[model samples]
Target: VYDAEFVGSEREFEEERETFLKGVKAYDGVLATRYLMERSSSAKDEELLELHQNFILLTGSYACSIDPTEDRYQNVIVRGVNFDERVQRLSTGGSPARYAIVYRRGWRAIAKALDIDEEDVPAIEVRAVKRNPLQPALYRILVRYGRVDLMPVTVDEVPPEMAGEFERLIERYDVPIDEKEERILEILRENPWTPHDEIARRLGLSVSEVEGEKDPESSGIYSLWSRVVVNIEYDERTAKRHVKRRDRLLEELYEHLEELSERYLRHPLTRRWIVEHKRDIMRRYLEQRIVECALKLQDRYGIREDVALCLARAFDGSISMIATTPYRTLKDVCPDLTLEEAKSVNRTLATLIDEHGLSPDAADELIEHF
Candidate 1:
């Protein structure tokens, strides 16, 4: 394609460029290529496919980098050929055969190029200027073509005053990261708002490399940093202590329930209720006790009826409120009263309040008379 007069035949080169650009399935690849040529005049005759091939080779694939011995590839891995058959590709001096690196989003095209089944490939869940950062061509290709968006870190360091917490977090989540990723994490932690290009520059990495390893959403480092260890307010009580106390209280509650179940639900003097009905019986018993306690508190302590009922419910940690008013409770609880009679009693009490200014106490006395 080269000629001394034209450098590379301008007409043929244009055709090749158009064909290459048209054939690229990735929009990012096309954009990056267009940008590269536009930014550099020397690149007018630059073989786009050759640059493309070189870019893939230099960056390396998730499959090529991962050790075949691993049960699972433990990194922010893109969809690429799994090195299942040959550990030799990872090692040195195997055969003339070479595996090509595929970007995260461009896996389908690479699979087609390699004559591999798309179903067989693993799909993974899938960057900036210099100084005021100039975008590296490889980084641009990866960001656009690979779909890598580098994440901004929440904290400035790996442990960041939460060294123990960080350790526990990784341990809890079982986060697997590489040493290189850990280094990227360090730079990110040093400055949470540091751009990918700045991180790449500091660590002597390609922006793509920083993008691949340091993505906060998927990267183990970001997962570790972003998770906040909440200081749950147990006041001065340690969680262990509170847990033990809760366990003891539950034991007491259960004991009380069991005793009640034995006395009423499974009474020796009568046909015991079925196991399923035990909870309903115990619930009725406790509700009865709450009302009894509230009544005693009202009479002895001279507490208001509603206030006494709340105090009684609090004693047993029961949140249930008596939705019925004192009139309703009396009407419902009074033995052998017909529904019609109960309705009549409430109407009478209601009328006494409107007509005679019968206070709540007088109504209670009137209810007692019924």
Candidate 2:
């Protein structure tokens, strides 16, 4: 009933938000909807109009909590969601509603929206249910795959028990590195300050190999390899100090990740992603903290733990998103937080501009970093 109604006024919007939250089945979907609703009053009209629609697309899905292997799922219909077919559209005559069964890019879009890798994201097929012209479509989901140990991207990860003819299906579908490249990568990783000549000397390779060639067609440790490794160019002194500061900051960030992982994220895949992509993750963490701290929140509110806790919940402890989200987004992420406290976050940042020595342009210059 609520899904069918068009939200025309603030009253209707509030009703929709409440009803959506009340009807959300999975715990995962609740957080997502709440996150979306946080900025309802502040969001632009165009964006606000589509917020609930986007929320449904991200978290609306129907699947048995019990694994398919535990019970026979064939031809079963729960409520109004279906999962029996690989791909099929349905036109129910009563409501005259249409549902397009989406297989490709269904889970991928959800993963991206939730700030997670598709591999780690839930494997669900979405049914884009058409609605009346006045209302937006409902993107309902159907879960069909379960988690396996490693490399979570492929169809082969499907449970063997669920596959009727595993061998025949396999017939239908379809190590680590170069030695010098590995050595060079490790040396650069260990000491980012190392010069090309020094790297060549340590690895007992030619300068050409270390620095690659100047030719159009060239492949070397620093050339082809650089696509994977970030090359930072600087004088020895600057490079040394940069490395030192970078290492110190990385340690603190790693500790924060460890604490967050222990408290909120317990998945092994999530843990591995944090370790593997710590640099990218920490880049966001550092920038986010800088932005949040500039708010002078610690001084005005003295609510450091509250801010921290909100950030943790706001991003769902997803390593890819934890400290990488916007400050305003954290405002509603924490249930205990109040609108005044959330509003204070923006107010406090003004102190950094007016009280301290930063102009808007100056702040922008300092804040823009990878």
Candidate 3:
């Protein structure tokens, strides 16, 4: 039951990321979690609250994630003490989680930016954010969860999804800028995605000259705001690269896989035998690759190709499974596999788990089973 979590971001979904992040308004750290929740019952789930909680709440020059350059996110700077939020404690002022919210721009802005219809922007989400799917909702969690693609954030590391727009405000970042260049940067900061012509029109500068200017780093204006991120690889596309993050994606992968094992196998990672069984099942279920994995004996297997593929995807993500049914001896529960492939998948549970940290204990069960 290995879950190939993406502490590593996936770039194929870049359009989705861009569409969602483009028009988010700022919020007050004194911000209520009420609007942030998917439903009223979600308010009761404090862990989810903490999961999607507003870590920063302030306004003005201090809008959370504000950067006067092409910046849209703050670096995942590492976890500080967990901010407490019970009974609505903490004064509005000087609290560590203070935040700011910019004005709410209607969906029209998002549609216009993505050149899509008003309805489309609300339809897709990163799964990290949830809504009725038919209705509009807050795109919360300004950051990627801890790095694993639902990776828990103790938190910080890869910068979160995005920031807000409040230009005429506190300049940007927690730093200073050159006065003349600051003007250009501030314009880019508030409207990082604005066209150069529109920017010139707004800035009273000649569009030709603005485009002709080559001072991106000095002024922090890029022809494309995508240039501003710490690394474009922030949104990775491969599992290989995904596992290599400094935080090491494998442990989280193992943790979530164990979660899946317990969920479908009725045993936790503590039950290495059960874990190993499902691991093998999942490996065979996936057939060592997307094109090959089967739920039963063949490509079509007992399960339909689509069903088998879906199961493979679900397991790779988090090893999810429902009860297995047998049409008599076809016997693939995907719920519980076997020892050989289990051994194979167990060692591979991390993909590249063995590459980093080099601990033999991490390999103990796998090697022994081998």
Candidate 4:
């Protein structure tokens, strides 16, 4: 089939949004509004953006790399796949697989790691370029560990400031990468916006801490998002100190990958796997390892996205104003609402905000509202 018609409208989007919220067990007034709005519009994209609706709406971005062991592959991921994945292949006179998955890393590492030799893969080649910086733009193409020598990447030396990051990654990941490593530089001259978040999921990172920066830090949590992280001014007083976004998120993820890479390379089980797999530092494998680590951190520290935002908004606004605001305003304005959800947020906000002396145990007991 060629491009699928977007057989949907704004009204329909609202309907879909309302339907989504009704199904969700949580709520954040502002966050719910954003969720419904995104779903509302995404609903129109039966083929396009709607597919990765959860990723885009929850994460606000897509990872442009791969996880070797497993993949977040869903047909909708095509939206965030190769730049070409945005449009229908048949519509553009292209066929499947070609537009499958492209990456900021070399296509070969991915090709070898998953060994999807002839499959129609869809990935993105995320890049972070620099035209006038101390360092040249960064490229993260992928290839098998054995192929590094065969595929020479002679690029400029690493900038001193960023050199440490590269060295650590090379050592921990047990790969031969550094400023001297002229690997896949010009093969893809893309100033990909820094690194991709695929690693971030593994890094399980939080954005810049409030200690140094004041520019607002915000985030979205998927499950209870419709109710929730209203980016308020960041400071030490806040319960949650860092917000996670794609840019810094990628940097932190890269660092986390280095740490994980060391763990895997040194692990007895992984060491045995490496021996059999003929793989040591394949970039895609790092992505997978990091994701496994990140998922653990996320599951542990990753409070319900909606819950985080819900509590955060309580800090941003007043329990009084929130209490006064009509629940119907969103259904009147939102794609929709719930008396229980709104009422729960109000109660939670009041207990936490007004008392100012709630204990941790008492606070966690409040999770049932979710």
Candidate 5:
């Protein structure tokens, strides 16, 4: 018989046991077990049996409990036979011993008691039952003989102060400095066009590598070469509008490739092709932006399908003639039209002009509704 004081109030124990069982039903066994064990003030034989039963149902295995009393027996002995296997009878002449057999239920209960996440739990395997007196009920209840590898691992979180030292030890033993550098280089080479900040993050390089130097030579030969390759690649593919203002002003067209690729992939017709040739297609698309823009303007704004063919000819001629004459004033060029029409035409033309020296008057005249 077990001691009475060690076993607390039945109602309290029952409430706690039921709460833990409910938790077992509600959450992953491992996690729930951890939570309950942490909160349980005392654990008794009956409560342990109930927990074991819940675990058995959840895990689907045969199990039982035993007692180990070191004072009563000179040798470790086991009692009870709830296992599905043949019982090995052994005799001992001391006090009654206690132990428990876990099976699928016990393992699951332990896992839940420890609060292991359900996703991390491995698949359970049922085995042929084995019974031996020396093995004891607790060992049989909780410990699987052939399936030791499937045992639940309980990890205690290291204190933050200790974690740093632990990480240092891991670094010393597991990661070589040269290997770390090689890993960094590999990451940098793989993403040649990656920004310095991103490259630093991916490669574990310092912030200085990303934000400090614009010229590769200022950093190192490898860094410089990587930057140059990235620049050349970007210049070959990005669109002008998407390029950073600073880089665009500096004529660093290569920096725009990443944005250009993004834009190319966004187009429906080009999307699938870009997905197949993601890097190369983006580069080509960036280089074709100006040509595409021109073609788009001609196709979208040039032809008047609703108007007479003769009217189309007139419209085409009027726009073409204005484009060819560089020095002719708008008033002089469109003399056939009224002042208002000429200003309207000049206003439209002003949007296309980017040269620094062009007079704003041309833009203003066109902008004012004639």
Candidate 6:
């Protein structure tokens, strides 16, 4: 918002007054009438004259004509020249004073003809403009008249002093920028994602300035990150069953692998068996490890039997491909174990072995004895 400044000189005042008067003249009759009538009542003639001297005033004057009867004093009728188009003439000092006189005379003449009180008769309407020193010209009119109905219909000359005061008042009030910063802050707080241009428009600031002023530390990035962490934490917290099953599978595989490794290291025959059929041994070990893990999940971790069965299927293919030697394959190694159980365990172990770096075949071979 631009700050208000004083209009110091008569010439400056006149220029400003003329500009304001032109705008007032363009208004409809109701506003014009109110503007004229209100100004006449509000400020003193001297103040108005000073405004005119400053050349910061515009005035619109109107004269009401009335006819008079034979009884010139008591039965007078107002009759005079039409003053609507006489704005320019009535605006001058001598002409305006003459206009006022004619207006009063006309009112008296009408009062006589109508047999009413002269004081009650309406007078001619005159409009004036002054520099909006303290406020906008339009607002000054409202302040002066309280209502627009009392203004005149034609434009008139404005005084310089009044124009200066108007300008001063407008500046003093600082009308346009009431609570600007507060309004901007309110808007920004409400919409975190509001674009910089949007903020600029609302705040009357430039987009570049807004963007430059924005600080990442004060932005919503922290809040967004917090929300993401909260969602992940919630999911993890809610997946109790999934988590338990996974942990149980891991533990079972660890124990089973340990047992197999120990057995292979200790038993001379089993050691030879591994050396001769290393690939097959490895495949069988993985298959057994998977089965053991699945069984542990089902019994201890409450994993659905159907899901465990599915896991077995995925492990079976992996085991068969690795154990190409039919004699030492998973099926051959775990002769006592059901094919379904072996496959289920194999699938579970295969996934664990891949992600956790375990030996699926070694696990299966260990299960052959147990």
The TM-score leader among the candidates is: 4
Per-candidate local distance difference test: 0.33, 0.32, 0.28, 0.26, 0.28, 0.30
**Clash numbers, per candidate:** 7, 1, 26, 35, 33, 70
User: 2 or 3, which is superior by lDDT?
Assistant: 2
Per-residue lDDT over 1-370 for candidate 2, one digit per residue giving the tens place of the 0 to 100 score = 0011221355544433332222222222222222323334443233322432332322232221112132211232222233323112221111101111123222332222222332232333332222101111011111222111110111233233212232232233221235665677577456443444446546655344554421112345423322221121223453244323332332333343344333323442232443354444435534654555433344534456666455534543232132222333454466565444433333322333546865544433332221
Ranked by lDDT, top first: 1, 2, 6, 3, 5, 4
Which 10 consecutive positions of candidate 2 have the poorest summed lDDT? Answer: 132-141
**Candidate 4 Cα outliers beyond 4 Å, as residue runs:** 1-82, 85-137, 141-156, 161-370
Q: Best candidate per lDDT, number? A: 1
What is candidate 6's lDDT per residue for 1-370, written digit by digit as tens? 1011222345444433332233222222222122222344443234333322211111221111111011111212223333222323221111212222222133333222223321221222222223222112232222121111221221132233223332333234323322443454355346433433345545544333333211112212212222222222123232344223332332332343334334323432222232344344335535665776456536633446665444444445232222222213544544444443433334433333454564655544443321
- True-structure RMSD, every candidate: 33.5, 23.9, 23.5, 22.5, 35.4, 46.6
Off by over 4 Å in 5: 1-9, 12-16, 19-23, 26-101, 106-370
> What tens-digit string does per-residue lDDT give for candidate 5 at 1-370?
1111112244444432342333232223322222233333453123432333233222221111111111211222122222211221212121122111222222343333223342332223222112111111112222222111211111121222212222232233332233443454455345323333334434433333333222233343233322332232222122222112221221211122223323323432221232344334324433443343334324533422322122223333333223222223533433343333332223234332433334546544433321
**lDDT, residue 113, model 3:** 25
**Judged by lDDT against the true structure, how good is candidate 5?**
0.28
Model 5 collision count: 33
Per-residue lDDT of 243-295 in model 1, one digit per residue for the tens? 23332332332243334334332342111222224344445546765887677
- Which portions of model 3 miss their true places by more than 4 Å? 1-46, 53-370
In terms of TM-score, which candidate is stronger, 1 or 5? 1
- Across 1-370, the per-residue lDDT of candidate 3 in tens digits comes to 1011112124423433342332121111112122223234534354434322222211111221222121122211112112222102322111112111111222222223233332222321121212111000112212211112222223233123332332322232233444554566666556444444345445554333343211123332321121222222333333223223412332343343344334333444332342234334334423544544444323322445554555455444221111111111112434344333332323232222334543334444342232
Model 6 ranges off by over 4 Å: 1-273, 315-370
- Per-residue C-alpha lDDT of model 4 across residues 1-370, encoded as one tens digit per residue: 1111112355543442332222111111112122223334443233222212222221211221122112212232222233223323322122122223222223333232232322122222222222111111212111111111111111122233322233232233323222211222222123212221221222222111101111011121110111111111213222121122333433333343334334323432222232243322233434443444334323533434443234324322222233323343312432223434444433443354346665433443442222
lDDT of candidate 6 at residue 264, scale 0 to 100: 27
Better of 2 and 5 by TM-score: 2
TM-score of each: 0.19, 0.19, 0.19, 0.20, 0.14, 0.14
lDDT of 1 at 274: 22
